[PDB]
Structure 1
C-alpha cells in the first residue's frame, strides 16, 4: 500500500484524482461549467495493500501510483484531503489504464 496526503487506502481500494474538466474546445469555444460532467479520466494517487483472493497470501492491486486510468460512470467515494476532491475506487472497478 502507498499513502497520499497522510491517507492510506485499505484492502484493494484505489484513490484517484479526476482530470481537469475541459473548459474550451479546440476551436476556441468556451464551455459552461454546469454542462461538464464528471471526468472519467483520472490518475492514481494512492493504492491499498490489496485483498487476499487466494489462501494465505496478499494479492496486490493491478494499478500503481502514477498510472493514468479510465473510471466507470458510478462507483466512487468522495474523499476530501486538504480541502480537495479525491475519489476512492475498488481495484476491479477501473476499466483500463493508459500506457506511454
Structure 2
C-alpha cells in the first residue's frame, strides 16, 4: 500500500481528497458557499494493501494514487491530516475512474 502524509489505509480502504467546489459559473456568476453540495469528484492520494477476497493471496485495490475518481453520495469517513480534509472509502464504493 501507498501512504500519504504518513497515513496508510488498512485493508481495502482508499483515501481521497474531494475536488475544490466551483465558486463561479461559466459566465461569471458567483455562487453561495452553503448552496454548494459535497463534490463527488476526487483524486486518490492513498491506497490500502487490499483485503483477501480469494484464498491465500491479497487482492490489490482497483485504483492507484493519482487516479481521478467519482465518489458516491454516501459512504465516506472524514479524516483530518495536517489540518486538511480527506475522505476514506471502501474500494467497492467508488463508482468509476476518469481515464486520460
| TM-score (norm. length: structure 2) | 1.00
Question: Aligned partners of 2:28 and 2:55: how far apart in 1?
Answer: 56
Query: Alpha carbon RMSD of aligned pairs, Å?
Result: 0.2
Unaligned runs of 5+ in 1: none
How many equivalent pairs are there? Answer: 100
Question: Aligned partners of 1:97 and 1:89: how far apart in 2?
Answer: 14
Unaligned runs of 5+ in 2: none
Question: Aligned partners of 2:37 and 2:6: how far apart in 1?
Answer: 29
Deviations 1:52-97 (A, max 9, x none): 0000000000000000000000000000000000000000000000
Partner of residue 5, structure 2: 5
Question: Aligned partners of 1:43 and 1:53: how far apart in 2?
Answer: 25
Runs of 4+ aligned structure 1 residues displaced above 2 Å come to none
* 3-state SS of paired residue (1:56): coil
Question: Aligned partners of 2:53 and 2:29: how far apart in 1?
Answer: 49
* 3-state SS of paired residue (1:15): strand
Deviations 1:5-60 (A, max 9, x none): 00000000000000000000000000000000000000000000000000000000
